[PDB]
Subunit: 315 residues, 3 copies
Amino acid sequence: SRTIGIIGAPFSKGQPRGGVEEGPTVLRKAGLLEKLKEQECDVKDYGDLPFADIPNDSPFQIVKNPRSVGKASEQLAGKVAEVKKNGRISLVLGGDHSLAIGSISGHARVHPDLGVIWVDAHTDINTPLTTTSGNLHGQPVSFLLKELKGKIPDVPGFSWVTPCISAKDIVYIGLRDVDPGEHYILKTLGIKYFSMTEVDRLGIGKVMEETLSYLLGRKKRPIHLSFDVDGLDPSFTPATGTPVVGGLTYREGLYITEEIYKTGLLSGLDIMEVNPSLGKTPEEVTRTVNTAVAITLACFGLAREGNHKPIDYLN
Amino acid sequence: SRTIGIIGAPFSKGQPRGGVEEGPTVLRKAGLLEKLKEQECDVKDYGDLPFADIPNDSPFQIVKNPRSVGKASEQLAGKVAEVKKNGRISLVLGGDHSLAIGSISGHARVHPDLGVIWVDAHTDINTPLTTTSGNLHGQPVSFLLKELKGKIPDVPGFSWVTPCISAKDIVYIGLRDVDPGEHYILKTLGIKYFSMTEVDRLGIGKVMEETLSYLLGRKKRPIHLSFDVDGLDPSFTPATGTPVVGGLTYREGLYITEEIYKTGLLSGLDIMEVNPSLGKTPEEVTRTVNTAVAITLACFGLAREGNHKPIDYLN
Amino acid sequence: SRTIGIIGAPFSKGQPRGGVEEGPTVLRKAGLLEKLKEQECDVKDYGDLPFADIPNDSPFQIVKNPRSVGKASEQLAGKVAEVKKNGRISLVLGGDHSLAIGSISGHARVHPDLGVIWVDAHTDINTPLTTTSGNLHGQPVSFLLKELKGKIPDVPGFSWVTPCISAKDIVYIGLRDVDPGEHYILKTLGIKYFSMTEVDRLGIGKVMEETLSYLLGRKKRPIHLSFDVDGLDPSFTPATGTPVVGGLTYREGLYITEEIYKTGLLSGLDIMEVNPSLGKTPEEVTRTVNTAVAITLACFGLAREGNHKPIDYLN
Ligand SMILES: NCCC[C@H](N)C(=O)O
Ligand SMILES: NCCC[C@H](N)C(=O)O
Ligand SMILES: NCCC[C@H](N)C(=O)O
Ligand SMILES: [Mn+2]
Ligand SMILES: [Mn+2]
Ligand SMILES: [Mn+2]
Ligand SMILES: [Mn+2]
Ligand SMILES: [Mn+2]
Ligand SMILES: [Mn+2]
């Protein structure tokens, strides 16, 4: 039985564009809870986290909205740990990706042996010192890696953070826009990744076999899937802040999640970067939201080959 | 030499939406016969079957237009058997997919050892008792399977039907929207299928190798290809009644058919669900029809690598 | 260090449609040189070749603009040989594909052991006698093959030509519209090709492994990549004269070039058939040009997994 703990995280200060804080609203409105219940799901809604306003939040060097970002993640981390303690798969509806700091942090408090699969067009592994944009949704992973401890300065709002994952406990899928400093970190820490080049070369089937084998080979452990919707091609998820052409297909998106579901190890899930305000047309918004919902439903059992209850349908 | 027997089947009562009965007209108008003759083809047109009107046709339980559907298939079955007896590959231009009952039935009368490849987003294997829509284009296969005998009630208009295929003589390709009862039947009868998940995992190349090996491994026998245009993604065939996103690509569509042609065993072909009335724009109609024609031409020899006559072109 | 020699070739008389002679202008305007320099590139611009007008140029049989086409290639051949002699990878911005005669001819003068990879929806291997269109952009390869010597009549403007490649030194990728005579030549000379059917069957990964192994297996030698933008699907490069559906994806396009770059053997490059005048909308033009630029940048090092300088980014 797949029990879920819904957590709305209407937050946008990890990046410039507003509208992404509406992600939880549009997804819910799309009937996400209803459709989840329509499946074999036990759904508990923990509501939308109220991210109080932090008016005084000047940049730290070039890092923008550090206290707002830091606080939102700290709050989310607490909520996620609570859902896990209740024996439910945490489902965080974003919101920009900076929230991954809180989501993965809170998840690790309850399940320290977790492994992370990061589906994204970006690595979001810039440090406060390697970033050129200063946008925190491009730095979450750097705050989480134990190996990057010593390279992360004391940024206001993140004193509560304690790196909880090692370079070896995370796999990237979908990369196609990686910054120079980010690439350096990838190669230096020996991080496992399947950029779009590897997906083209091997096919999504082998990519997933290798990804799960890499993380679950030595032993089984909880899986945390942080899914940035811009990991998929803009033809499928156009309403997002940092779209990059040549992305994962709708089919590959569903394949990744169907395979993750089949492990029975999904422990935490993030659906990030859905920004309804960035849809060039009303249809682009629904296309984006519909795809995000589809990806979510696949994570919890919906299979393209079909699904049926433990009953005799012919009798 | 590939000799063809064209059979127009302007029928739509297996489903709600009208316009699909125009399929034969638009395909022909697209120059299908001319282009077929432009190849190495011997083409004989048997015309469009005149499906007399059956005004009195109330539902059987929830099954709609049973007598109309039953009669159209009975007529088509007779026509197809006639074309086969003339030593020609029957080419049925639909028309909704309920016609598969007649097409495969008539084909089996002449070639009982036939194997079926079903390209579709759906399994169309609901029984009159498992269907929720009552639309007969979602039940053709149930009427044809010998194993499902005993589960098919006496529906008005189908007393002439005699299941002619076993669960082991059919392979599905493209599935992505299968009903619960349908999935139950798939798993219970051990039916071979390659849903979109398997195509993503293995690639269309291995899918076809396995499909042909599965049906022709023990021995060679006539192949019946029932191609529902909604098997391909709506980006290629939008003018259809039951479109589902994440479908087979134009390329995969041509690959399936090129490979089937190469066997030299194509015996019967169905081109179904083309509905010109459902095109949101004039271009969507031509896009759909053009793709349907392309698929058809590939079934009869047109290869993307090129084609040339048994002559010395350089001399 | 990858040093490049830019050569603008604003020529269109190898085909009917004007506008393709604007290819060098739109690509440059797109910041191609700037972006190349933004990489690890040493860029030298040799300018746009001034293709003087040849008013008196009646057809040779049905072959159109023979003297204009012949002269433009003769000029380009000289320029390319000059760039190679300067130790730089020649980068020819077309212009229609008839220019390949000059580009590959001039390249071979300096590097006779070169191997050619031809990415295109067409084989462009018609002879002046097998062509039905008379358009010379559909015949460049026939003029270059040593084996086709004796089948090429004395066409005005090409007396300077001397076939420089053998059937075994070229590989085609992307074929989907090959003429009958062309197919005959393919099979008769035993030319290695991966039509769209082979790409579907094997996947672009194996296609490239086989392509490079085929050309570099016996020994390493300079590679000449003649890239016709219509090799990619029209959804990515619509502004081109002879588009054909079911082409290579944006991803496959980048994969081919990333793999070629990694060999360290790219010696000559052609970016052909970009026609800004054929864009049905301003967006179709930018989409086409943007993709052409992306393909070019990949040939010279830009990797989707990321790039970084030989420095310590964390310090
Ligand atoms: N989440 C997008 C991050 C984009 C860019 N690498 C940055 O650091 O801003
Ligand atoms: N041919 C489409 C059938 C769709 C649905 N499974 C049904 O039974 O109506
Ligand atoms: N470059 C396109 C060539 C198209 C056709 N095969 C021809 O010979 O004109
Ligand atoms: Mn991203
Ligand atoms: Mn992200
Ligand atoms: Mn269907
Ligand atoms: Mn169907
Ligand atoms: Mn071409
Ligand atoms: Mn060409």
